[PDB]
Paper text:
The papain-like protease (PLP1 and PLP2 or PLpro) cleaves the polyprotein at 3 sites, whereas the 3C-like protease (3CLpro), also known as the main-protease (Mpro) or nsp5, cleaves the polyprotein at 11 sites. As reported for both human coronavirus 229E 3CLpro and SARS-3CLpro, PEDV-3CLpro is a homodimer containing three domains in each monomer. The active site of PEDV-3CLpro, which contains a catalytic dyad formed from residues Cys144 and His41, is located in a cleft between domains I and II. Domain III is involved in monomer dimerization, which is ultimately responsible for forming the active protease.
In this study, we report the expression, purification, crystallization, and X-ray structure of PEDV-3CLpro in its unbound state to 2.10 Å. PEDV-3CLpro crystallized in space group P212121 as a dimer in the asymmetric unit. In the absence of substrate, water and solvent molecules (MPD, DMSO, and IPA) reside in the active site of PEDV-3CLpro, which is solvent exposed on one side. Interestingly, different solvent molecules are found in the respective active sites of the PEDV-3CLpro monomers composing the PEDV-3CLpro dimer, where the a single DMSO molecule resides in the Chain A active site and the Chain B active site houses both isopropanol (IPA) and 2-methyl-2,4-pentanediol (MPD). The presence of different solvent molecules in each of the active sites of the dimer supports the assignment of one biological dimer in the asymmetric unit. The LSQ superposition of 229E-3CLpro and PEDV-3CLpro shows that the overall architectures of both the 229E-3CLpro and PEDV-3CLpro active sites in their unbound states are structurally very similar, and the active site residues of the catalytic dyad, residues Cys144 and His41 in both PEDV-3CLpro and 229E-3CLpro, are located in almost identical structural space within the active site cavity, which is solvent exposed on one side. We found the overall active site architectures of the unbound PEDV-3CLpro and the inhibitor-bound form of FIPV-3CLpro to be remarkably similar with the catalytic dyad residues (Cys144 and His41 in both FIPV- and PEDV-3CLpro) in nearly identical orientations despite Cys144 of FIPV-3CLpro being covalently modified by the inhibitor, compound 6. Interestingly, in both the superimpositions of PEDV-3CLpro with 229E-3CLpro and FIPV-3CLpro, the loops comprising the protease subsites of the 3CLpro active site are in nearly identical structural locations, with the exception of the loop that comprises the S2 subsite, the S2 loop. The S2 loop forms the outer boundary of the S2 binding pocket and shows positional variability across the X-ray structures of 229E-, FIPV-, and PEDV-3CLpro, which may lead to differences in the size of the S2 subsites across 3CLpro’s.
Author numbering:
A (entry chain B), B (entry chain A): 1 to 301
Write the structure that this text describes.
Amino acid sequence: AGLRKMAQPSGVVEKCIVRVCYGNMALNGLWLGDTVICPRHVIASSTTSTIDYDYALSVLRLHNFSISSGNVFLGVVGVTMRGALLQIKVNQNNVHTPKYTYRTVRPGESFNILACYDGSAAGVYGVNMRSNYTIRGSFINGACGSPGYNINNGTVEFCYLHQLELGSGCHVGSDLDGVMYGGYEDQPTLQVEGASSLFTENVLAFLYAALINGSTWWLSSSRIAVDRFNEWAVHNGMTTVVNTDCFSILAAKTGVDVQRLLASIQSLHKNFGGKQILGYTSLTDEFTTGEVIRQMYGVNL
Amino acid sequence: AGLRKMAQPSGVVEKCIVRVCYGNMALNGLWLGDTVICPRHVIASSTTSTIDYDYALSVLRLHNFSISSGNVFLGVVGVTMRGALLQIKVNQNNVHTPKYTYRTVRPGESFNILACYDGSAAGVYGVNMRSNYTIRGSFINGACGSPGYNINNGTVEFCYLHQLELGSGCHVGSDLDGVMYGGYEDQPTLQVEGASSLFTENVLAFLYAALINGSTWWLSSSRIAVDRFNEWAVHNGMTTVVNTDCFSILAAKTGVDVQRLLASIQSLHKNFGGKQILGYTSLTDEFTTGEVIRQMYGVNL
């Protein structure tokens, strides 16, 4: 029973976390093999309304870098830059490097955040990439470099390195190829979050978990076809539906089709009335179909 | 910015999880030093029905215990029962045993759950102890023995060992001294759940966090005396507030007093009804004042 936004265990990722310092900057890096990865703004000036990374790199001294894993200092061999990241060759292999890949997360997808400060993990929590390519994180100053990832068995799948905070307080990172998510800039300017929509396919996922837990009071007696819901969605701040059938298992075990849930969704936005749905905004899109199926039955999506 | 129900990093605890098998039956155990601690229904009848634990115990053989830390089977030298736990002595001292301690949590306090299956960590998430000594967790079959803990500056503070799920989906565990939270029984017996009530203290903490984060639609134009609130609260499944102190810093920074928040809580109770507070269900009481101060300012108590 139960449904929790959870993280997967952080042990394997905690071992790769390092403290990178340069000039007036300190943040967190990822140490994999003999390369250390961190946000390039570690080499910026903290006082300019603007960062000239080209300048900053041109005039860089390797002996101004302070990088550590625990109390052990790693020696800087040299630096390369890619997108919003530095890739720092160091003189030591991290023996604790797990098997890993890189992936860029798509909107509506979940992953873990390991929130780091001074090169060590402080908290771990699950998030979901929003349609405006931000996440609703929890971060205070010094968090830059905090990694996001999923663990697929197996392999650590890195998807996020924490870069900045928008004016609304939601946050943005880059993938590990250095591409900023949503096209934002790694500049100290206060940038702005664009319009987002509840990710409908995840709302559906959430409803099924709720039925399965005996949350029923919201359940509509009526039903509504998929595209006719879609035309309502695009002008009601909710995303359209494409994955027809990742709900087959759920629909079958509840005997509640998708159209019925779509009807319930439409009813639920116009608000109430009653209260709880396990919790949970009543209408959250933080849970993917994969997640829900897993906490319901413990199975590879 | 941001507020997230998170977990502390689980690395130090993951290396203490083991598979505990008597026969026959299977669950998770905690391997500290040369002791394995696990729930005692591991020896109990494979589910039909009630457990005469003295009978089960008198008849027990140590070699009917297979205990695997991942790959290695541990060898059982002896066993002692404490409340609803078994403490099993083994051949070897868990090399990675952290500095630890036991503590029993009070209703309305938060801690971490490390959800284990087959003797190893699969998920981690933060919870808060409800006033009827249960927690709203996320477990499915195989989860018994999953530890709950707080990490206080290096020291792992063990406060919870998962024992059972009630008819409601509530979860019940014992402290690491074998004491069943809330007086429940580690029995396959039909069992009832006490009446709970939201911790107003925690709700306040949350609402103050919302303000600090510039979520301010929900905020009342009105005040209500603390006394008057307390009268209403006991008819509406909310705890009374009797100490104002722990909100001074927050009232300071926002300029907004608790009596104004109290009026807001009443108003939100008769629902709201359009959309989120920091991502949640208008209200939640899963956050303490300490939790909130911590994620806002990175500072304790």
